[PDB]
Every structure is written in C-alpha cells, then in structure tokens.
Amino acid sequence: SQTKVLLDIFTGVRLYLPPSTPDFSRLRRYFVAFDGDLVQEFDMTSATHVLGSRDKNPAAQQVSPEWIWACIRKRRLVAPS
Amino acid sequence: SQTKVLLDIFTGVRLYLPPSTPDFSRLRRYFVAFDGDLVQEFDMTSATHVLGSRDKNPAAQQVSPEWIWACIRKRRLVAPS
Secondary structure, eight states: OOOOOOOOOSTTOEEOOOTTSTTHHHHHHHHHHTTOEEOOGGGGGGOSEEESOOTTOTTSEEEOHHHHHHHHHHTSOOSOO | OOOOOOOOOSTTOEEOOOTTSTTHHHHHHHHHHTTOEEOOGGGGGGOSEEESOOTTOTTSEEEOHHHHHHHHHHTSOOSOO
16 A cells, blocks of 8 residues: 655756765665756756856755755755755 | 655666667656666666567566566566566
8 A cells, every 4th residue: 555656856956966976876866766857967057956066057056965865854855955 | 654765676677778668767767766777778788687679688588668667566576578
C-alpha cells in the first residue's frame, strides 16, 4: 500500500552538479529522483541554482548540498541555504 | 512517518538508455532513483543489460521499459522481459 510515485520536489530547479561536490553520487541520485534538472557543464549558464560562487551566473540562487537534503526531508523546496 | 530513503532495486544493473526510447525522461528518472547505473553511449559495451538487440553486447540481459516498470512495482528485480 506504499506509494509507487516519486515526489516532484525539485521541478524547475536547473542545477549543475560539480563532480568534486562531496557526496556527488548520492546527491545526483536523490536530486534526479525528486524531479531536479541536472545540466551539463556546457549549459551551466542556463542554471537557476548554483553550488558555490555566483560569479559565472549572477541571477542563480546559491544553494548547497545541505539545502538539497533539507528539501528532501521537508518534501518541498525550503528557503535557500 | 513516511520513508525518506529511496529503495535500491537496480543496484548493479548497468544500462545504456537510448534517447529514442519511448518515455525516456521518466524511465531515466525512475531507473536512477532506484539505484540503476546509467552508462553513456561510449561505455555501452560495459552494460549488463540492454534494450533492443544484443548484437553489440552478447552477454547482456535483454530487457525493456516494461521490465523497468515491473521491477519498480515489485520493489525488486523481476525475471527479465
């Protein structure tokens, strides 16, 4: 009687995930699972969110791996951190 | 009180998913969510499972999108189809 449907938490969140990110594999897995849009390096200027510096994409919202997990815990987007 | 953990159904299943696969986006999302290993085109000879012909990888197990969904329904790998 458990759900067979993944929640859509990160719908519309376009994020480049640097391979150097600690815990990259699990972050990628969970972000994709919950409807996040991973962009490749060549497309990082189209991201809406960034890990680390905003210098290459000033309009992007700065977030962190900790934010990704927090959103997953809450089952929705939380205020960026 | 709902789980925060994705099930590991496709652990060790290495699969190249052709972009032409009907329902590609959702298949990719769900396969990744449940611990599947997507390989890129240049690495398809290392796959353990294949959609379509085995001519380029005779040892691979032939499966289908329908198999992927069936595994998800059962919460475990089912006999290939």
